[PDB]
Design a protein around this motif. Structure first.
Motif, PDB file in Angstrom:
ATOM      1  N   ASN A 102     -10.092  -5.873  -6.947  1.00 40.97           N
ATOM      2  CA  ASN A 102      -9.753  -6.824  -5.893  1.00 40.97           C
ATOM      3  C   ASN A 102      -9.931  -6.215  -4.505  1.00 40.97           C
ATOM      4  OD1 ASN A 102      -7.525  -5.092  -5.936  1.00 40.97           O
ATOM      5  ND2 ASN A 102      -6.105  -6.722  -5.346  1.00 40.97           N
ATOM      6  N   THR A 161       6.732   3.953 -11.572  1.00 45.22           N
ATOM      7  CA  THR A 161       6.639   4.805 -10.391  1.00 45.22           C
ATOM      8  C   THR A 161       7.611   4.247  -9.363  1.00 45.22           C
ATOM      9  OG1 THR A 161       4.337   5.417 -10.798  1.00 45.22           O
ATOM     10  CG2 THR A 161       5.170   5.675  -8.571  1.00 45.22           C
ATOM     11  N   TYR A 162       8.653   5.009  -9.040  1.00 47.15           N
ATOM     12  CA  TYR A 162       9.757   4.523  -8.227  1.00 47.15           C
ATOM     13  C   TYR A 162      10.009   5.456  -7.053  1.00 47.15           C
ATOM     14  CZ  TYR A 162      10.917   1.147 -11.833  1.00 47.15           C
ATOM     15  OH  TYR A 162      10.883   0.114 -12.735  1.00 47.15           O
ATOM     16  N   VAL A 186       5.287  -5.842 -20.385  1.00 47.00           N
ATOM     17  CA  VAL A 186       4.943  -5.147 -19.150  1.00 47.00           C
ATOM     18  C   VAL A 186       4.619  -3.694 -19.468  1.00 47.00           C
ATOM     19  CG1 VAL A 186       5.880  -4.280 -16.986  1.00 47.00           C
ATOM     20  CG2 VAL A 186       6.215  -6.671 -17.618  1.00 47.00           C
ATOM     21  N   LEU A 187       3.467  -3.219 -18.991  1.00 48.67           N
ATOM     22  CA  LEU A 187       3.041  -1.849 -19.240  1.00 48.67           C
ATOM     23  C   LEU A 187       3.333  -0.903 -18.087  1.00 48.67           C
ATOM     24  CD1 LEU A 187      -0.555  -2.821 -20.442  1.00 48.67           C
ATOM     25  CD2 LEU A 187       1.488  -2.734 -21.865  1.00 48.67           C
ATOM     26  N   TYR A 188       3.394  -1.408 -16.858  1.00 48.75           N
ATOM     27  CA  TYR A 188       3.582  -0.569 -15.685  1.00 48.75           C
ATOM     28  C   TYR A 188       4.223  -1.399 -14.585  1.00 48.75           C
ATOM     29  CZ  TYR A 188       2.466   2.290 -11.588  1.00 48.75           C
ATOM     30  OH  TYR A 188       2.534   3.019 -10.426  1.00 48.75           O
ATOM     31  N   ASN A 189       5.088  -0.762 -13.798  1.00 52.30           N
ATOM     32  CA  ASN A 189       5.741  -1.433 -12.684  1.00 52.30           C
ATOM     33  C   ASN A 189       6.110  -0.404 -11.625  1.00 52.30           C
ATOM     34  OD1 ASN A 189       9.000  -0.934 -13.231  1.00 52.30           O
ATOM     35  ND2 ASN A 189       7.762  -1.019 -15.096  1.00 52.30           N
ATOM     36  N   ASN A 190       6.272  -0.882 -10.392  1.00 50.77           N
ATOM     37  CA  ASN A 190       6.585  -0.013  -9.267  1.00 50.77           C
ATOM     38  C   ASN A 190       7.250  -0.833  -8.172  1.00 50.77           C
ATOM     39  OD1 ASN A 190       4.573  -0.371  -6.731  1.00 50.77           O
ATOM     40  ND2 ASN A 190       3.487  -0.871  -8.625  1.00 50.77           N
ATOM     41  N   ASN A 191       7.877  -0.128  -7.227  1.00 49.51           N
ATOM     42  CA  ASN A 191       8.523  -0.751  -6.077  1.00 49.51           C
ATOM     43  C   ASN A 191       7.911  -0.285  -4.760  1.00 49.51           C
ATOM     44  OD1 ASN A 191       9.573   1.868  -6.064  1.00 49.51           O
ATOM     45  ND2 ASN A 191      11.542   1.197  -5.230  1.00 49.51           N
ATOM     46  N   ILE A 192       6.678   0.212  -4.802  1.00 54.00           N
ATOM     47  CA  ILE A 192       6.004   0.767  -3.634  1.00 54.00           C
ATOM     48  C   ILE A 192       4.703   0.013  -3.379  1.00 54.00           C
ATOM     49  CG2 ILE A 192       7.097   2.964  -4.138  1.00 54.00           C
ATOM     50  CD1 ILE A 192       4.883   4.012  -5.411  1.00 54.00           C
ATOM     51  N   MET A 240      -0.435   0.902  -2.120  1.00 53.47           N
ATOM     52  CA  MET A 240      -0.566   1.488  -3.452  1.00 53.47           C
ATOM     53  C   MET A 240      -1.888   1.062  -4.063  1.00 53.47           C
ATOM     54  SD  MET A 240       0.124   2.505  -6.754  1.00 53.47           S
ATOM     55  CE  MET A 240       1.603   3.341  -6.236  1.00 53.47           C
ATOM     56  N   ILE A 241      -2.607   2.003  -4.671  1.00 54.90           N
ATOM     57  CA  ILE A 241      -3.826   1.673  -5.400  1.00 54.90           C
ATOM     58  C   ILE A 241      -3.778   2.344  -6.767  1.00 54.90           C
ATOM     59  CG2 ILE A 241      -5.374   3.546  -4.720  1.00 54.90           C
ATOM     60  CD1 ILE A 241      -7.246   0.840  -4.046  1.00 54.90           C
ATOM     61  N   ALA A 283       5.872   2.454 -18.470  1.00 52.37           N
ATOM     62  CA  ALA A 283       5.534   3.382 -17.401  1.00 52.37           C
ATOM     63  C   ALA A 283       6.045   2.854 -16.067  1.00 52.37           C
ATOM     64  CB  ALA A 283       4.023   3.611 -17.335  1.00 52.37           C
ATOM     65  N   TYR A 331      -0.696   6.785  -3.508  1.00 52.23           N
ATOM     66  CA  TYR A 331       0.302   6.205  -2.619  1.00 52.23           C
ATOM     67  C   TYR A 331       0.661   7.240  -1.562  1.00 52.23           C
ATOM     68  CZ  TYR A 331       3.252   8.933  -5.727  1.00 52.23           C
ATOM     69  OH  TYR A 331       3.801   9.948  -6.471  1.00 52.23           O
ATOM     70  N   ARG A 338      -5.121  -2.983  -5.887  1.00 53.12           N
ATOM     71  CA  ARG A 338      -4.283  -2.586  -4.766  1.00 53.12           C
ATOM     72  C   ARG A 338      -3.231  -3.655  -4.500  1.00 53.12           C
ATOM     73  NH1 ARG A 338      -6.453  -3.881   1.282  1.00 53.12           N
ATOM     74  NH2 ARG A 338      -5.481  -1.868   1.778  1.00 53.12           N
TER      75      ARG A 338
END
Lengths: 114, 114, 114, 114, 114, 114, 114, 114, 114, 114, 114, 114, 114, 114, 114, 113
Positions: free
Chosen positions: I36, M82-83, K31-37, K41-42, M80, K111, K84
Motif C-alpha cells: 500500500n 510489538t508494544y 489475529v496473527l500480529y498487533n501493535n499500538n505504534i 510503522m512499516i 505476535a 519503527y 504501513r
C-alpha cells in the motif's frame, strides 16, 4: 599509503621434551632450550623435576652469558615461568651426589614473524 | 588500491624423522634437515638422543657454512630449539668411539608462501 | 571493486610412496617426484633410506636441469627437507656396488590453485 | 553488490585403480586417467609399477596430444607427480618383450565447481 | 539484503554397480549411467573390465548424442575419468566375437541442489 | 534481521527394495518408487535386473505423466541414474513372453525439509 | 538477540511392522500408519506385499480424507514412497476374493521437534 | 551473553511392554502408556494385536480426556503411530465377546530435558 | 536551520516465498506480493517457474488495476524484473489445462522510511 | 569468559527390581522407587503385574505427598510411564483379598549432574 | 546547536510464529500480529497457508477497524506483503467447512525508537 | 586460554555386596555403604530384603547424621533409590524379634574426578 | 562542545520463558513480564498457547493499570506483538473450566541505557 | 602518520602445574611462579592445597622482595587471586610439622607483546 | 580535545544460579542477587519456581530498602523482568506451610565500566 | 594527535574454585578471592553453599577492611553478586557448630589493562 612502517605479526609455537642427566664426578649444565632470536622473544612454560638424588638449579641466561633468573628445585616438584629477552634455559646438576636426574620441560614462545 | 605492496601470507609445516649413524674410523656430519629458503624462515623443534656410545654435537649452519649455534648432547636426552635464518641442522659424531648412534628429530617451520 | 587483482588461493596436497632400485652395472637416477608447476611451489617432506649396499645421493633439480641441493645418505637413516622452485627430486645410485636399494618418500606440497 | 564477478569454488576428488596390460607383438599405450576439464585442473598422485618383463614409460599429455612430462619406471617401484593443465596420463609398454605388466594408480584432482 | 542472488549449494552422491552383456550377433551399447541434469554436473569414477572375449569401448555422450570422450579397454583392466556436462556413459561391445562381458562401474557426482 | 527469507535445509533419505512381476497375457507397468514432492527433488540410485525371460524397459515419469528418461535392460545387469523433478520410476514388462521378472532397486533422495 | 524467531529443530524416527488382514465378505481398509502432525511431516519408506489371493491397493490420505496417492500391488512385490503432508497410509483389500493378505511396512519420518 | 534464553535440550527414551486383558461381562479401557509432560512431547511406536476373540479399538487421549485418534484392530495385526501432545494411549475391549486379548506395545518418546 | 525540508531516508527489505496453485476448471490470478506504499516504491527480484502443465503469465499491476508489465513463462525457467510504482505482482494460470503449478518468488524493495 | 553460567550436564541411570507383597488384613502401600532430587528429574519405565488375587493401583507422588498419576492394573499386564518432578512411585494393594502380589519394575532416570 | 529538532532513529525487529485454528460452527478472525505504534510503522513479511479444508482470507486493519488490504489464499501457498500504518494482521476462516487450518507467519517491522 | 576454570570430569563406579545381621537382644544399625565425598555425589541402586523375621528400615544419612530418606521393607522385596549429597546408607534391624536378616545391595555412584 | 545534550544510547535484551497455571475455582491473572522503565520502552515478541481446557486472554497494561491491548487465544496457537510504553503483559485464565494451562513467551525489549 | 606512538598489543598465556614439598627440620619457601616482566603484568588464577600436615602460607612478592599479599590456607581448600606488578608467587611451609605438602597451581597472565 | 567529558563504556554480564529454601516455623527472605552499583544499573532476566508447597513472593528492593516491584508465583511457573536502579532481588517464603522451595534464577546486567 | 590521554582498554578474566573449611572450636574467615587492583575493578559471580552444619555468612571487604556487603546462606543454596571497588570476598563460619563446610565459587572480573 603514507608509511613504510610494516606491522608486527607475532606468532606462537610450543614444544615439550623430557630431560635426563647422569652425574658421576663433574657438575652438569644441561641446556633444555636455546634460540637466536632473543630480541622480542617471550616464553611461558614449566620445568618438572621428577626423580633425582639432590636439589637442582634452574637458570635462565641471555646472549651475554649473564643470569636473568635462578631458582632451586627438589625432586618431585615443578616450577612455572614467563621470561623475555633470554638466550637459553638450563638446569645445573651439582657434582656432589652421583646419580641420574630426570624430568620434563614445556615451553610456548611468542616472537615476531616479520 | 593505492599500493602494489602485497601482503605476506606466512604458512607452517611440520616433519618428524628418526636418524641413525654408524661410526667406524671417521667422524660423521649427519644432516637432519636442510632448506633453500633461509631468508624469512623460522623453525622450532627438538632433537632426541636415545642411544649411543658417546656425547654428540648438534650444530646449526647458515648458507655461508658458518655455525649459528652448537650444543652437546649425552645419550638419553633431548634438546629444544627455535632458530631463524638457517640453512641446515646436523649432528656431528666423533670418530673416537666406534658404534651406532640413534635418535629422533622433530621440526615445525614457518615461511612466507609469497 | 576497484581492482582486477584476484587473490591467490594456495592449496596443499600430500603423497607418500616407497621406492626401489636394482643396480647391476650402470648408475641409476631414480626420480621420486616431479611436477610442471615449479613457479610458486614449495614442498616439505623426507626421504628414508632403509636397506642398500652403499651410500646414495639425494638431489633436487629445477626446470633447467641444475642442482639446487645435494645430500648423502647411508642405509637406515632419513633426511628432511623444505624446498621451493624445484622441478624434481631424485636419488642417484652409484654403479660401484651391485644390489638393491629400498626406501620411502613423503612429501606435502603447497601451490596456488589460481 | 557492485560486481557480477562470482567466486571460484574449487573442489577435490580422489580415485584409485589397478592397471594391467598384455603385450604380444605390438606396443601398448594404456591410458589410466582422462578428463575434459583441462582448463584449471590440477592432479597429485602416484603410479606404481609392481610386476613386468621390462621398464615402462609414464607420459602425461594435454588436449593437443603433446607430451608434458615423460618418465621411465622399472618393476617394483613408484613415481609421484603433481601436474596441471593435462588431458590424460598413460603408460607406454614396448613391443620388445612380450608379457604382462601390472600396477596401481592413485590420483586426487582439484578443479572449479563453477 | 541487497541481492536476490541465491547461493549455489553443491552436493555429491556416489553409486557403484556391476555390469554384464551377452553379444550373440549384434553389437551392444550398454548404458551404465544416465542423468537429466547435464547442466552443471561433474562426475569422477572408474570403469573396470574384468572378463570378456575382446576389447570393448567406453564412450561418454552429451544431451545432443555427440561423443565427448572415447577409450578402449582390454579384459582385466580399469579406466579412471572425470567428466563434466555429459548425459550418459556407456560401453560399446562389438558384434565380432560372441560371448559375455562383465565388469564394474563406480561414479561420484557433484551437482547443485538449488 | 532484515529478511523474512528463510534458509533451505535439504535432507537426504535412502530406501532399497526388491521387485517382482509375473506376466501372463498383459503388459505390466510395475512402479518401483513414487512421491508427491516433485518440486526440488533429486534422486540417485540403481535398478538391477537379475532374472527374466526378456529385456525390460526402465522409465521415469513426471507429474504430467510424460517420460523423462527411458532405458532398456537385459537380464543380469544394472543401470545407475541421477534424476531431478520426477514423480515416479517404473519398469515396463512386455506381454510377449510370459514369465517372472525379478530384480532390486536402490534410491537415495534429497529434498528440502522446509 | 534481535529476533524472537526460534530455529526449527527437525528430528527423524523409524518404525517397521508386519500387517495382516482376512477378507471374508467385506472389503478392508487396513490402516498401517497414522499421525496428527501432518503439518511439516515427511515420510520415506516401503510397503511389501508377500502373500495374498489378489492384487491390493495402497493409498495415502490427508487430514481431509482425500487421496494423495494410490498404487496397485501384486503378491510378492514391494513399493517405495516418499510423501509429505499426509495423515495416514492404508491398504485396501477387495471383497472379491476371500483369504488372508500378509506383508510388511517400513517408514522413517522427519518432523519438527519445536 | 545478551540473553537469558536457555537452549532446549531434547532427549529420547524407549519402552516396550506386553499387554493382556480378560473381558467377562464389562468393557475394558486398558491403558498402555501415560505421562504428565504432555506439553512438548512426541511419541512414535506401534501396538501389536496378537490373539483375541474380536476386534479392539486403539485410542489416544489428551489431558482433557478428549480423543485425538481412534483406530480399529483385528487379531494378528499391528498399527504404527506418531503422536504429539497426548496424555495416554489405551486399548478399548468390548464387553460383547468374553475372552482374553493379548498383544505388545512399543514406544519411543522425545521431550525437552529443560 | 533555514528549512523545514526533512531528508528522505530510504530503506530496503527482502522477502522470498514459494508459490503453488491448482487449476481445475477456472483460471487463477495468484497474487505473490502486494503493498500500500506504491508512491516512491521500487522492487527488484525474480519469479521462478519450476513445474506446471502449461505456460503461465506474470503481470504487474498498479493501484488503479491497470497492467504495467506482462510476460510469459514456460516450466523450468526464471524471469528477473525491476519495477517502480506498482501495487501488486501476480501470476495468471489459464483454465485450459488442469493441474498444479509450483514455483518461487524473490523480491527486495526500497521505499522511504519517512 | 563473560559468564558465570555453567552448563547443565544431564546424566541417565537405570535400575530394575522385582517386588512382592503379602496382604493379610491391612492395605499395603509398597514403595518401589524414591529419590530426593525431584527438581529436574525425569523417569521412564514400566511396572509389570504378574500374579495376584486382585487388581492393584499404581500411584506416583511428589514431595508434598500429593498424587500426580494413578492407574489400575490387573494380574498379568504391564504399564509404561514417563514422569517428571516426582518423589516416589508405589503400588497400593487393597485389604479386601488376602494373598501375595508379585511383579517387576524397571526405570531409567535422567537428572543433572551439576 | 541551533535546533531542538532531534533525529529520528529507526530500528527494525523480526518475529516468526506458527498459527492454527479449528472451525466448528462459527467463523474465526484469528489475529496473527498487533501493535499500538501504528504511526510511522512499516512491516514486511509473509503468511504461509499449509493445510486447511478451504480457502482463507488475509486482512490488514488500521486503528479505526477499517480494512487496508484483503487477499485470498488456498492451501499450500504463501503471500508476501509490505504495509504501513496498520494496527493488525489477521486471517478470516469461514464457518462453511469445519476443520483445522494451520500455517506460518513471518514479519519484520521498522519503527522510530524516539 | 582466558580462564583458569577447569572442566568437571565426572566418573561412575559400581559395587554390589550381600549383607547379613543377627539380632539377639539389641537393635542393629548395619551400614551398607559409606563415603567421604558427599559434596557432588549421586548414587542409584537398590536394596533387596530376602529373608528375615520382621520388617526392617532403610535409612540414608548425610554428614551431619540427619536422615534424608527412610523406608520400610518386608521380607522378599526390593527398593530402588537415587540419592544425592549423602554420607551413608544403612538398614535398621529392631530388637523385637531375634533372628538373622539377609539381603543384597547394589549401588552405582557418580562423582567428579577433579 | 556547545551542548550539554547527551546522546541516547539504546540497547536491546531478550528473554524467553515457559508459563503454566492451574485454575480450580478462581480466575488467574498470570503475569509473564513486568518492568519499571515504561518510559521509552518497546517490546516485540510472541505468546504461545500450547495446551489448555479453554480460550485464554492476553492483556497488556501500563503503569496506571489500564489496558492497552487485549486479545483472545485458543489452545495450540500463537500471537505476535510489538508494544510501547507498557508496564506488564499477562494472561487471564477464566474460572469457568478447571485445569492446567501451559505455554511459552518470548520478548525482546529496547530501552535507553542513558 | 603524525605519531611515533606505537600501539600496545597485549597477549595472554596460561600455565598449570602441581607442587610438592617435604619439610623435615627447616621451613620451605617453595616458589610456584616467577617472571622478569613485572612492569605491566597481570595474573589471575588459583592455588589449591590438597594434602598436608598443617596450614601453609601463600605470599606474593615484587622485584624488591617485599610482600604484596599474604594469605593462609588449610588442607583441602583453594584460593583465587588477581594480582598486578608482582615478581613471584610462593608458598611458605613452616618447620613445625614434618611431612609432605601437595597441591596444584593455575595462572593466566596478560602482558604487552611490544 | 575541547572537553574533559569522557565517554560512558557500558558492559554486560550474565549469571544463572539455582535457589533453595526450607521453611520450618519462620518466614524466609531468600536473596538471589545483590549489588552495590545501583546507580546506572539495568538487569533483565527470569525467576523460575519449580517445586514448593505454596505460592511465593518475588520482590525487588533498592538501596533504601523500599520495594520497587512485587509479584506472586505458583509452583511450576516462571516470571520475566527488566529492572533499573535496584539493590537486590529476593523471594519471600511464608511461614504458613513448612517445606522445601526450589527454583532457578537467571539475570544479565548492564552497567558502566567507567 | 592533540592529546596525551590514552584510552582505557578493559579486559575480563574468569576463575572458579571449590572451597572447604573445618570448624572445631574457633570461627573461620575463609577468604575465597583477593586482589590488589581495587581501583576500577568489577566482579560478577556466585557463591554456592552445598553442605554444612549451619548457616554461614558471605562478606565483601575493601582495602580499608570495612564491609561492603554481608549476606547469610543456608546449606544447599546459592547467592549471585556484582560488586565494584572491593579487595576480598570471604565466608565467615561460626564456631558454634563443629563440622565441615563445603561449596563452590565462581567469579568473572573486569579491570583496565
Amino acid at each position: 599509503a603514507l608509511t613504510c612502517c610494516p606491522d608486527k605479526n607475532y606468532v606462537q609455537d610450543k614444544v615439550c621434551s623430557p630431560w635426563s642427566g647422569t652425574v658421576v664426578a663433574t657438575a652438569i649444565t644441561n641446556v633444555l632450550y636455546n634460540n637466536n632470536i632473543n630480541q622480542n622473544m617471550i616464553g611461558t612454560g614449566f620445568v618438572r623435576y621428577d626423580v633425582g638424588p639432590a636439589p637442582i638449579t634452574l637458570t635462565v641466561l641471555d646472549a651475554a652469558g649473564a643470569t636473568i633468573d635462578t631458582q632451586t628445585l627438589n625432586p618431585g616438584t615443578s616450577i612455572a615461568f614467563t621470561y623475555r629477552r633470554f638466550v637459553t634455559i638450563e638446569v645445573t646438576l651439582p657434582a656432589a651426589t652421583a646419580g641420574t636426574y630426570q624430568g620434563e620441560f614445556c615451553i610456548t614462545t611468542r616472537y615476531p614473524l616479520s
